């Protein structure tokens, strides 16, 4: 697994899941999203109904609209980043698992039998398909383009969220929209959108690192095969090569040396 | 266990549970799902018994009882996708469990015998029987139900979701149907429908990606016997084959490599 | 342990501890089980005392009584349920557990020696008792009966629940019946009630299928010894059986093969 | 250890610990244990202070004193029931593992050079002891009497709980007994008294069961020596014995079966 | 470490943080430790205000004072009692353990030379110190001391808190002395203290067993050398002791035996 | 890994966590970072949806804007410190892993060969190398810089934060600018603001360690190469050199010690 | 570690997180830590504004000022308890670990060429540094200097808050100091400082032991060089030696013996 963009991924999931949480927490601390004044003659729970109204009421200036609904927005975001790492962890990793495993002992052997190519066959054979590359492209650049939504959303949120904190609405509504107590709007104010669209800023700040950095997790002929993409897993996985290592040392230094190594 | 329609499966109890629990966690944050006016005479309490009222005179325009239920009929359908899971954990896994751990063995003496036909006997033979493929089919398409209905409750649900956001409630009942200070009905406000009718949209959204993918599960003939089940086993559980990765390598380079080998 | 029981047991379980514990975080959603109204007069103290006077006066229509009670008779259900499993676990899991591993090792002496019958002289021996399968049939249909009688109490609630989801309470009472400013009555809802009889409905409609099932389990002359309960022991142990497994593939395609197993 | 009596123990133990802990879910739930009338010119707060006066004032017609106190005196009997169980987990079960271990290895060499009497020495030795057998039987007894003044307390509870959920409290006191405002007594009802005494018949109910159950457990004459309570031993350990089983089996059958055994 | 000690300490640990969790719960539970009267005319606050006030004026009859320290002053000897197990944990436990298994196989090899006197020689000579028995006399009975001063202090709390549960507090203090609709004194009711002077008697109770008991562990001469005190030891692990059980039963039964056992 | 800067970093990161738990755990002990004053005639809603508008208005002196936003730029710099040990455990901590591997055992087989060069060829080969040594710089001071910005944003905070702990809020706006009840604007203290200043100080003072040490891990020609960087993971990683202490020893000392050792 | 070192340390760490976790759970269970009085006519808001006015006022009769800060600052002690650990535990134990061990097998060799020099020589060689031995003083004192101050500020903290309990507290600030309705200055409570005078000397008082206590440990010529430190170590790890008790039981006994031990 390609730890930067796993990392980049790890950190991607980290950052909403926090804010989210935290905006829960807020939630939790504010209690309430959303109030709206009230005639003082309004009870102590009257004007607890048309907080309530009004906070219902936002389905019914679009962004107001959308301003509630904001935060699961957000989870679903963090979902749809989480799920392609779950759907690559089939589409790739139990293929390179047994590739891995397998490279290792030939090498091993290409190893030992100089101390003392069949895998070089399979990869420049695996050299053949494109499938397990176009793989990777699909599902990164799919769990990217949820990250390219999600930060044109805040965008097209924060840019608009600054100026529409409040609106006015109306409960005077059904039979009780002929309660002339009622004003015909309350003022009201949309009091988590401020933390919201700092945290919307906040959020795109940094996923405007991690677009570009997995961006340049493509630029592979400077970093066009599964080879390239082994090449990939090479230079991933010489993490796990002793013998590499031995030989890169040998390598290095270049059967004294293999017989004291 | 077959990956993708288990990660499928765990996806799709994940959804819900996460739905559910911040519908929990909202209606904790919430407190209520309703409220309703008062006059200013009623008292800070005497509101609360109208809420408290008319959340229990849902009981008593059909979907606005419906509207209520909403969250833990949706509970109902998690635990509903789940059991099918534990009930296929005993259908077939203990079956495929002893099958592939003889299968392996055998088509290892296969490869041991060729480096120096039981299972093969065994699978074509059960080949012979529809028992085990029809607990598939029975027990995934049960599963695929549940999903059905859910997301056509959740349209019907949605589709007058829309327009039914809120109702009259009449408190003026029993004795205290004497009392003209109750007004014959309050308006009352369904506070959580909005946030239900986007999460029903969201989860139905999400399950018209599940409801398909399963589906294409069983295009066999193009991804009729258990044999063509254990092809997918097959497909599967080639997992788990460290000689038929070998032999795949040979197969993909073809004694001496399996001498190497 | 016979799987489908026991999750059947584990599902039987499962519902009602959901179900009272959403109960209970609905219970802790709602804050009360019920409400009553109040003059206006009544301060915001003299009408929470009214509402907690009626909660507490449903111990002197008797289902109104009842109502109150109802879940924590749920839960007495539940633990009802449950410890029937820790009694079988002992009335006969210690039994079996040292019959299986003796069966085990001899049948599989017997494909050793037959490769190259004290527990058929055992197991036939077993055939002589009516005890353990008397164990069985007691300890599984107290289980069941304990379903019985929830669904009919469910039933019995149900029925008249759906009649009874309010009264009038009086708390003119004692010395404090004399203040004419308490009304002879208040009027009550029941604010839970709806909940439960629909949760009732619901473990209802799902005990439903859970008696059945385990009546079903009865049926052994179609699934009258020891044996016929060992046959069922054989029908769910055959799972631990590697030499089952072996003979009935060797059954399956009946020494070259006993040599090749 | 007795499974049982450990099992009816650990039972014994859970049940209450499931009631405390519901009745303090249920004092979270409702709060308060009681409350009082106020005049409505009693403030928000002066109502409120009366109800805490009340609920105090409970320790200066006995039972209502015990009223309040009633869930810890609960939880006082659970502690009760436990500790015996640790005190016996050292009063006899640090003799029994040795005793055991030694009993098995012994009883296997009588089986093995069967094959091819230290113990029963050892065994009608401990006939003499009266000290062990009079450990369990005041070990087991002085917890089964928790149990009984338990019942007892819940009986002489219940009996006349049934009478006596409300009192009027008096908090016209000190100098502001001459606060005239203040009436002479407040009525005040009992709230949780009414879900205690149905806790304290579903105790009650249930610890019927466990009474005579550990009785039943004394008539070992038909179920006077540690030999007859190691028969216990035996009638237990036997779980621990391969041999016993095999020559179990072989008593169930009866050098060559002791050869294929 | 001697269980019966042991687990009276655990016991006696147990029970207070038992009491204080729980009074934390009904501190929790109640949220006040007290109120006090104010005239109608004080706000939800200005009451609100004399009740904290009231609360904080404890600190300038006397136990009055102390009654709002009660809890953490429970808590204060629940600690003074853990500590001397950490600190005999390690005045002694050290040396013990290095001394057991010293005393063990040296015993083992006087059991294996007799099948086939260090210790002896160790332990008579440990004989001569009396520095470790006297670090568990001192360890012990500062213990034992805590329950002493804690026993008192909740005998002199309980038998004055039986006449103390209320005072008059005065608020009209400072420049708000001068607000002559402050009462120069509210009347106030120390609401936890009925509950703390049960708890004190319940605690007090349950430590007139653990002190006493302590005490007993002490009448070694009928349980004056660490020898005496290795014969507690002894007496204690003997526990350990395979040889000394098989020389028990050897000793009970008294080479062919030793060449049996 | 280095442990001080390590250390300082497990430190540096606990220190905010701590300090924004605990704001949050205050938060959660305030309710609100704000309140602001209101007439009287403003409702116990009306007073609430003032706190809440002006709560909301921060984002339209300007510290006073970054006052409410104080928090979440803290939790902001804890990531930001984070993440660099993460970003490090990979940028060089595969590569030492290796190496170090590598060099013990050729290090030991020269001390196994002095009992009875490879890692010294490849270390000052790796004397060649400036990418690794720049790896470690950039990615501490970057960490570093980290700090700086917070201690400054601190400082600048806390400056002017001396200056800002309140201000007068409008929320006579839109609409309801037009009604009159609501003064021009209410005058609103900044709650948090003096713990959070205090919390900066606390935070920055203990900062003002952190950086200066960092600093002082980069005088290493003092404490040039990745040798001297090696040199630092010499004098790190002797940590893990049995052979080294040996020949350290055997160094403090100076073929009999080496048989010997 | 040295162990009553680190004991008293960890217990030292354990007091304050105790009392400031209370502390917590006590400010969790007042909900603020101030409160003042109002005019009646300041609104259930109006009050609350001013309270947490002043409550935020604390930062404009020093100790006044210290006061509300006081808890915080005890965590500052704690955390500046606890790190001198961990950087003891890098200062000398990665040492010692590597020391102990060579130490033990070179004595153990000692030991074996007995039965049948060089940590001697080695120790006698540590004899020569002052670096590790200063070490210890240095973290170990700068440890205790943390318990001086905090000592201290809780005298100088006590002494005082014994007559500042309470304060006159202005809100007519601003705009709204020109509000006569606010009084020029409320009366206030500084609730929790009796709770934190009592907790203040609760922790003084067992600081005092822990102080002396590590000054005992200083006084190694009665309990000059890292030898005597060793000697300490020795004191410390013969816990770890076999062979020493098997040679002190030898020395206390005194080849044969050495045969049999």
Same mark, same amino acid.
């Given at each position: 697994?390609?730890?930067?963009?796993?990392?980049?991924?790890?950190?991607?999931?980290?950052?909403?899941?926090?804010?989210?949480?935290?905006?829960?927490?807020?939630?939790?601390?504010?209690?309430?999203?959303?109030?709206?004044?009230?005639?003082?003659?309004?009870? $102590?729970?009257?004007? #607890?109904?048309?907080?309530?109204?009004? $906070?219902?009421?936002?389905?019914?200036?679009?962004?107001? $609209?959308?301003?509630?609904?904001?935060?699961?927005?957000?989870?679903?975001?963090?979902?749809?980043?989480?799920?392609? #790492?779950?759907? $690559?962890?089939?589409?790739?990793?139990?293929?390179?698992?047994?590739?891995?495993?397998?490279?290792?002992?030939?090498?091993?052997?290409?190893?030992?039998?100089?101390?003392?190519?069949?895998?070089?066959?399979? &990869?420049?054979?695996?050299?053949?398909?494109?499938?397990?590359?176009?793989?990777?492209?699909?599902?990164?650049?799919?769990?990217?383009?949820?990250?390219?939504?999600?930060?044109?959303? &805040?965008?097209?949120?924060?840019?608009?969220?600054?100026?529409?904190?409040?609106?006015?609405?109306?409960?005077?509504?059904?039979?009780?929209?002929?309660?002339?107590?009622?004003?015909?709007?309350?003022?009201?104010?949309?009091?988590?959108?401020?933390?919201?669209?700092?945290?919307?800023?906040?959020? &795109?700040?940094?996923?405007?690192?991690?677009?570009?950095?997995?961006?340049?997790?493509?630029?592979?002929?400077?970093?066009?095969?599964?080879?390239?993409?082994?090449?990939?897993?090479?230079?991933?996985?010489?993490?796990?090569?002793?013998?590499?290592?031995?030989?890169?040392?040998?390598?290095?230094?270049?059967?004294?040396?293999?017989?004291?190594?």
């Amino acid at each position: 697994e390609l730890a930067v963009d796993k990392m980049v991924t790890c950190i991607a999931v980290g950052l909403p899941l926090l804010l989210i949480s935290l905006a829960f927490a807020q939630e939790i601390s504010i209690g309430t999203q959303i109030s709206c004044f009230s005639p003082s003659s309004f009870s $102590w729970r009257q004007a #607890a109904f048309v907080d309530s109204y009004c $906070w219902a009421a936002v389905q019914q200036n679009l962004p107001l $609209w959308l301003h509630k609904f904001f935060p699961y927005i957000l989870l679903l975001f963090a979902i749809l980043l989480y799920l392609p #790492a779950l759907f $690559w962890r089939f589409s790739a990793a139990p293929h390179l698992c047994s590739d891995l495993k397998f490279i290792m002992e030939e090498l091993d052997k290409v190893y030992n039998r100089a101390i003392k190519p069949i895998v070089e066959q399979y &990869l420049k054979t695996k050299k053949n398909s494109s499938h397990l590359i176009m793989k990777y492209i699909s599902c990164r650049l799919v769990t990217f383009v949820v990250i390219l939504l999600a930060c044109i959303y &805040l965008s097209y949120y924060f840019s608009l969220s600054s100026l529409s904190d409040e609106f006015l609405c109306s409960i005077k509504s059904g039979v009780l929209k002929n309660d002339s107590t009622i004003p015909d709007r309350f003022q009201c104010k949309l009091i988590a959108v401020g933390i919201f669209q700092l945290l919307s800023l906040i959020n &795109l700040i940094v996923y405007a690192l991690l677009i570009p950095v997995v961006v340049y997790t493509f630029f592979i002929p400077f970093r066009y095969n599964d080879l390239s993409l082994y090449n990939l897993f090479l230079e991933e996985n010489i993490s796990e090569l002793k013998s590499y290592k031995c030989l890169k040392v040998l390598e290095n230094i270049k059967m004294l040396l293999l017989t004291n190594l």
